Symmetry: C5
Subunit: 130 residues, 5 copies
């Protein structure tokens, strides 16, 4: 399999072994009533860093949790600090696939199109080889 | 965790102003909510190890008014109900390691049932 | 509030003329077709700048709106003809800011409906809240 | 007539004396009869200071072709190197207004909303005085 | 006729030569048709003049994008990994028209308006001479 497929699968699995919710392999664009709670594992900004002649890449690893419609940002944090944060401390699979990992950001996005969901995004900055 | 407290501190500060408060930028608006006051964070981001895990975020306090009102009305509201409360919020002061003015923007409903002013500061803290 | 004083210092000045336009105190979102020619005065990216100081930098805008089926040349003409003169000197505006300088001259249009065509003349100013 | 007005005219005129629908400024929504359309406009015009008791400026000059419906980008290039390029070789009137000219880019843009129209945009960076 | 046309084609031709499977596009499609999927578009973006060298040299981002509807990214990787990377492995016809090619990024994009499709975008940074 391609290295990106392995990446998310390492996280995704660590998520199932653990959390009553529906997961997606990649940022979804739409959901069905039945998808919430939703947790998407995906990558963004994958880029080739090696021009010091290294094959080295870097990317933003995403674990975004979606909740149905309009909820407070604190309900998202609770879900984040109670069903995700923990799982992101022991995921040996992930370790073996990457060369470095570090906390990146923590964003809040919402469906500014059809107000169907509110989300919290936990992202790490990673480095690896294709 | 920590962002709930941060946001909360300010929400409880502005609590004590007949407006409708929102913990995190709203998406859709039911006009009963106007004047709407939202408190949220943008660009929260890890910044390294001091010993203690540092983070930096952007704290927002945006006031929304129904329809298309003249920016000034927004400033007026902002000058009368928001700044006063912002001058001193100990609860907040205790959760942060530093705070400082960032900017002041005027946004609006591009797709137009509301216009707004959004006060911001840059805060640093430990998660 | 300074932002309000600034825009005002500019609005009146500019609207003290026979200009048969409509003036807005802020970048409007929805335009009634009966609102053109339109003239809006607003600020963007106001940021605190401070070295310890109360410097605040912002971008002053004077946008001219006209029906979307109009050549830029016309907007250009509208600009040289009614705004530039007035903008050459506004003592009310001067006594509020600590510096002003030409910045840009952009061209915009309504991408959805396609109801208007505009020209945005901007300056960079500095001041203290 | 102010500088920008004169700048566009130069190119505008050149294009006329030589055969589609020309617009003085980037248009928003076209009418079936507008194709093929060519737009000559400016973007990013900014003051770069004063040189010597004179007001200096920089801007991007655009000559954009719009072809009816979604078409291969190769059709655009073809139309481009056939009607546009030649005229651009040397436009006196223009050179007599500017202070410096050089090629910037060649961008492809489409009607994201619908296959309404496809376009190839040829740009230059110029410096002039107001 | 001109360079951008030869560039895309070298890629397009190499790709169909390898796997006629999808419907290829010369440029980035504005809108698709239920049938086209799988879609594979070959295009350039940000082509900018970088100067003269005794010859005028340009720079641009070459794109090979695979569109599928809203399916998991790993499936996009999988198509990318078996219908694309092998070809891109080395394409003489292409290399023969440029000066340098380097890997840039791997972006996952998607339909935002109607969720009609989801894609994987493979990009290389290339230098050539008009």
């Amino acid at each position: 399999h391609m290295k990106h497929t392995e990446l998310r699968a390492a996280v995704l699995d660590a998520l199932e072994k653990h959390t009553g919710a529906t997961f997606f392999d990649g940022r979804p664009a739409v959901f069905d009533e039945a998808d919430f709670p939703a947790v998407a594992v995906y990558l963004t900004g994958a880029e080739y860093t090696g021009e010091e002649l290294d094959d080295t890449w870097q990317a933003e690893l995403h674990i975004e949790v979606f909740l149905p419609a309009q909820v407070p940002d604190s309900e998202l944090d609770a879900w984040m600090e109670s069903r995700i944060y923990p799982v992101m401390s022991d995921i040996p699979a992930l370790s073996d696939l990457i060369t470095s990992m570090v906390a990146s950001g923590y964003d809040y996005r919402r469906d500014d199109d059809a107000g169907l969901w509110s989300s919290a995004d936990l992202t790490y900055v990673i480095t690896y080889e294709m």
